[PDB]
Write a protein that binds this ligand. Structure first.
Ligand SMILES: COc1ccc(NC(=S)NCCCn2ccnc2)cc1OC
Ligand SMILES: [Zn+2]
Length: 323
């Protein structure tokens, strides 16, 4: 084998100080994200649609314009759906693709198809336009610091296609993109030339954002083998609050709760979990009240919650990568 795959286990953050924290909090811009990253994704974008091509062009253009040297790949493939064989396209965004280890942030960019009841269209605002915009705003806000990337450890973004069921949530009608990509990565040697390690060995931590943007979210701590990382989020939130850097935020209504959970919730991280990759699943439970209705729209999102989570996520990635 090789030794580097085990560094994720012992990896520790480079904790940030009061001054840096202020600089992060100030460096992220909620209304720039809103106008430039989010609003254009608030469109119907089910697999194959016009909006899907549009959302993919948007995500890629917004990344390609940054200073950091992001290598974009599209994992396009065909899969059997209840409505025939269809085309799906995962978007992968990697700094230092030959970097042995990556922290991986992920979300899905497709929206669920609903027929247009009452003359309205499902735009999946929490599900997951806001998580996509959060990733793009992260890449923008952190861009100056990501430059530094030129431990062999870097950053990857994954925007999964076809997370949603076409008809009803089941094993063969859901997770089209993550199931394909996990299998692709599993059989691909990493770094190249390697004999016993795959791109999955290189995934330090898979952080999956889903269903983000409603007010008062509460995020359970889901799995045994990722909890110190969850604990870091709890700490970052605490410190950001104490330093007075969150908005409309009370410590009683903390997002990250050391409340444990019964069932896992099925999502794009499952085909990676099944292959033994560590996962931080940032999905709230209860799901937003608007979940899978036409009310999951822009007007029901909460500015301050998203701003706060953005601040917290950007800190977390700065600490994990030692930047
Ligand atoms: C209504 O609240 C729930 C409904 C279902 C589940 N259980 C599962 S396994 N859901 C898989 C969700 C997959 N997905 C993610 C985004 N779009 C679809 C939990 C819920 O509240 C905790
Ligand atoms: Zn959904």
């Amino acid at each position: 084998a090789s030794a580097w795959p085990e560094e994720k286990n012992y990896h520790q953050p480079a904790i940030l100080n009061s001054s840096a924290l202020r600089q992060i909090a100030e460096g992220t811009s909620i209304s720039e994200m809103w106008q430039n990253d989010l609003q254009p994704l608030l469109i119907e974008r089910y697999p194959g649609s016009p909006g899907s091509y549009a959302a993919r062009q948007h995500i890629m253009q917004r990344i390609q314009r940054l200073q950091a040297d992001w290598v974009l790949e599209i994992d396009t493939f065909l899969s059997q759906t209840p409505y025939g064989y269809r085309s799906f396209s995962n978007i992968i965004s990697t700094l230092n693709p030959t970097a042995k280890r990556h922290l991986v942030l992920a979300c899905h960019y497709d929206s669920k198809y609903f027929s247009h009841w009452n003359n309205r269209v499902f735009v999946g605002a929490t599900d997951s336009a806001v998580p996509c915009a959060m990733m793009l705003e992260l890449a923008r806000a952190l861009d100056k610091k990501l430059l530094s990337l030129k431990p062999d450890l870097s950053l990857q973004l994954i925007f999964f296609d076809g997370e949603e069921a076409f008809l009803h949530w089941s094993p063969q009608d859901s997770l089209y993109g993550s199931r394909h990509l996990a299998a692709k990565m599993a059989s691909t040697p990493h770094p190249p030339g390697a004999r016993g390690t795959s791109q999955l060995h290189g995934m330090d931590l898979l952080v999956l954002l889903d269903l983000i943007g409603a007010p008062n979210p509460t995020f359970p701590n889901f799995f045994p083998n990722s909890a110190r990382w969850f604990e870091r989020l709890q700490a970052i939130e605490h410190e950001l609050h104490e330093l007075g850097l969150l908005k409309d935020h009370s410590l009683e209504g903390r997002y990250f709760q050391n409340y444990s959970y019964g069932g896992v919730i099925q999502d794009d991280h499952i085909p990676f979990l099944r292959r033994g990759v560590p996962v931080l699943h940032l999905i709230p439970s209860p799901f937003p009240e608007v979940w899978h209705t036409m009310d999951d729209n822009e007007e029901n999102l909460d500015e301050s919650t998203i701003d706060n989570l953005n601040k917290i996520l950007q800190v977390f990635v700065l600490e994990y990568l030692h930047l």
